[model samples]
Target: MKKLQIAVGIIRNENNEIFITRRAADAHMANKLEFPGGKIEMGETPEQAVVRELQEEVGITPQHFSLFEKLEYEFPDRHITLWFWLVERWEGEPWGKEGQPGEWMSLVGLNADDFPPANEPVIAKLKRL
Candidate 1:
């Protein structure tokens, strides 16, 4: 049996910059930067999960957004399908929730050296699209 995992990616924009969070050294992806989001619950869809996570993790509700793309990755123990959303508008200012600190970074100023391995592909795709 294959384990299925669903996650979401939120690119919060402010003055053309996007928000990113650094994982704690004790986290699964230690020392890596990632967009805020997490696993989807059994009863929730990816869209619902993202919205809920946004509010829980970043204190915002996505009011204007679009599902930009989906990507699947395989690991030795599980397979993950991530739903990436491009949020044009949302309510409230983003703040760190769930114990992670969020930082605002310009898209042109992103430093790939600091991001998580899983996020590299997504950032690459965003650059291409």
Candidate 2:
């Protein structure tokens, strides 16, 4: 079984709105809303992966973000580990560099349906925090 690890960032602007983007229509989770991030490559720590993914996907540098929680799940295809972080501050305006339209939504009222199933635990954890 192949194990995969991904770094996901839940970015909060000054007003506490969370930043998220829709998956590209051609992606595995096509049209699903998700926190901006990507798979962690070999030789990279979760932290490093998040920084790189932010730049690659949104075209900005994460000024700093704190580790939130980690979730592990098993899909029929792969066993996945997700490293979640809270990005309270970052540099540059976050637009979808990958052509995936994104938005800022108040954390107080986000629909669970917006994201993929793998993201459920992350959102539930956020609600409790």
lDDT tens string, model 1, 21-122?
Answer: 777898666878877777888989878888888888888887767877777777665677777788768888888877788878777777667875556676
Candidate with maximal lDDT: 2
- Candidate 2 has its poorest 10 consecutive residues by lDDT at 120-129
Which model scores highest in TM-score? Answer: 2
Residue pairs in collision within model 2? none
lDDT of each: 0.74, 0.86
Q: Write the per-residue lDDT of candidate 2 for residues 1-129, one digit (tens) a residue.
A: 889899988998777688888887887678898999989999999999999999999887886689898889887777889988888888888998978788888887877787878888778877776
Flag clash pairs in model 1. Answer: none
**Residue 51, candidate 2: how far off, in angstroms?**
0.3
What stretches of model 2 exceed 4 Å from their correct place?
none
